[PDB]
Design a protein around this ligand. Sequence first.
Ligand SMILES: O=C(O)CCC(=O)C(=O)O
Ligand SMILES: O=C(O)CCC(=O)C(=O)O
Lengths: 411, 411
Amino acid sequence: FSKIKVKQPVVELDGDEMTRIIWDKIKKKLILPYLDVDLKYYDLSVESRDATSDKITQDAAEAIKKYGVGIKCATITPDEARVKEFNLHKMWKSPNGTIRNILGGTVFREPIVIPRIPRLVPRWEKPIIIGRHAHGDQYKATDTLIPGPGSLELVYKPSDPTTAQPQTLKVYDYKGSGVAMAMYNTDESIEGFAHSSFKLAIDKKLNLFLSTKNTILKKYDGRFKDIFQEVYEAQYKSKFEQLGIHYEHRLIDDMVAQMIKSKGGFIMALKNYDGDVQSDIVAQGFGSLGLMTSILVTPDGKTFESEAAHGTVTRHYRKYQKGEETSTNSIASIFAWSRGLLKRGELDNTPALCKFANILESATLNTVQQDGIMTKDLALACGNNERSAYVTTEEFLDAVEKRLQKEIKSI
Amino acid sequence: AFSKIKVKQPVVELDGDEMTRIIWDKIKKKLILPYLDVDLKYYDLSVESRDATSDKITQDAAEAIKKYGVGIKCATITPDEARVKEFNLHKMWKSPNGTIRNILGGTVFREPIVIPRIPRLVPRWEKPIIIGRHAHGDQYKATDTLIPGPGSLELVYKPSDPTTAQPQTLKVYDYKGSGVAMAMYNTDESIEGFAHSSFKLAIDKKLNLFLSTKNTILKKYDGRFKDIFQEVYEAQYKSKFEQLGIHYEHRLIDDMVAQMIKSKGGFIMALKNYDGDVQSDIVAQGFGSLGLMTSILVTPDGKTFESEAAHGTVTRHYRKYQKGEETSTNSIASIFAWSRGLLKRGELDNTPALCKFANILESATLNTVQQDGIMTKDLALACGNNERSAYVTTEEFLDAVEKRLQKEIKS
Ligand SMILES: O=C(O)CCC(=O)C(=O)O
Ligand SMILES: O=C(O)CCC(=O)C(=O)O
């Protein structure tokens, strides 16, 4: 096969355990044999991050910004148990949280639909896309234990007193021990969130819903509502009217209820935390947490980070190390690669690359849909409880490879 | 019965707004007052009443509930920008529910009202899912504000007793541009109450209990909910759980909502204030309709209760009612607010006759739909029946329930 020439380099972030094993096979068998790619490799395994005191994560984020497209393998955020078992320096923060904070933007999540997989919410016939604000709020929050009675205040001091007033807000007078936290966001970040959301709505020709709790957090959430409306009237109003699509702000309560009783087919812009929770509800409702894509996008339309949206399970790895067979789904990791390559193709105007990314995806879905070859989790979701109903982690990937070859020849 | 049942202690009634107020009075006159000799401590929480008393009536009502033990509340309107304008309100008064919950503290238990006949949007949900929502702080008592430009943001705590605690000045953020900020709190006392009520309900209903948090991100704040529940659990409920064969477990909110969507129901989800607010609507919708859900606020000591109609009022229905136009609004949620409240009243006063009445009221109400197929517009549409004849009017439904109440009260 005559290899497709990728013009610009692609930033690759390796991950942990089982997904790392899967990641290497995908790269060696499904990508490298067909593409001549310059991969800027960053090892984000727990061991690598510990050894560099998490500096490797920051470097990888900056590389993505430099080159434009990053593709990331699922990683492990160590807990107390792991820190002790592997003698880590500390409970390192989520590489994902770190990358999102550095790149900023929006994380778009949507189900990977496989006809055969049963939907847990039957009426969802059309994809629901979650546009999760990638920055601030709880993920960059300051929280602390309050040991006893005392006052708690939120204090703001402008860098320039003549252009702004200081603020000292009474938060609470404790009468006993408790907890406290403060969080923030910026208008610039919220504005980018809005631009990407409106642009995706336009590009996909879908209605856009922004949801908040601005009835309770009148200033904080109210700010998201006002910025979205302002951006809407600044550059997208007539575009939406021309396409016949709509933008509407809704109370988060009402939105999730309408989402649950709908047929899908719309985009839900959500604050960082709500986007996190709801994307799992949506992924699960469509069929499986393992069938979801996740791509971080910056408002300038120049930077993308495609990540394996399905976490790795240490149990599978344990069995893998013991030489026992496994059946871990590799679809989410395959799509991280395909969606990243698609952005690379678009940015570089390399149609041959985009075509490849699309067949890689169809060959993967058809292996399941048409050939009935799948891993344990999907077989089970399908009510196929026979041992012979699924193949091993490696068998699935070998099947996809064979399919990729076959489908590539057809063209 | 036809003699009337003597309710020993007064019941606090909080009247509401628009269409729900209309249904509320009909319920009282036809389904409650004719059978019960009850002393109702009436508090009008309509928008006009609250505006006239500068929201003082809401505070008085909450204190009456604490004084007498049981309150029954009709749905109320939380004014927004437009409403303040159209009705010249003095202020955008805060939600009465948030005010009442802050004063009484405790936990709000949300549970679906199951009518087997009504289709479920999440098919596998065959067993009730109960949401135990912490009713106190977090974002419902938060302090939020806009940040005009560059400057420092700090969370400052000053202990009342310098010897037992140190002051804290935590740098929240250094703005380089305008943005938003907020701070919130909760207390060990409130969280402990939340835990006790949750474990007791689990033991009472013999269901597994899951507490969900984002303690991976909010290590101190959310970690406190996790630690207090575990302490309380091991100290006085673990043994009983083990005897009953039920389990308690803490889960990441991400995993829990996914497991919830994939499950068959049959468990209690203890959730922080905000998550409980959002997830209860998802659960209510999933079982069939937002209008089929009960909501009862319970205090830890077990002596105070506020049964509320969770089904918000709809202005369009009210406007039609005003014009004398035909209406078909569901009253099931309002009926259960009364029944559930009367049950608490009966249990506290040890009045078996009241509890029997409350139960027959509920049975008559649901059988009116389940057996007689008599229902309002929303339920009929839920059953995929769009013909006019498929449903009855608001009044017709209530008359049907009243008739069955009389039938089933002699039976
Ligand atoms: O890194 C983590 O802890 C999870 C981040 C996340 O929400 C995602 O990758 O979708
Ligand atoms: O008053 C409000 O804004 C809604 C409160 C709520 O969530 C409830 O009553 O269940």
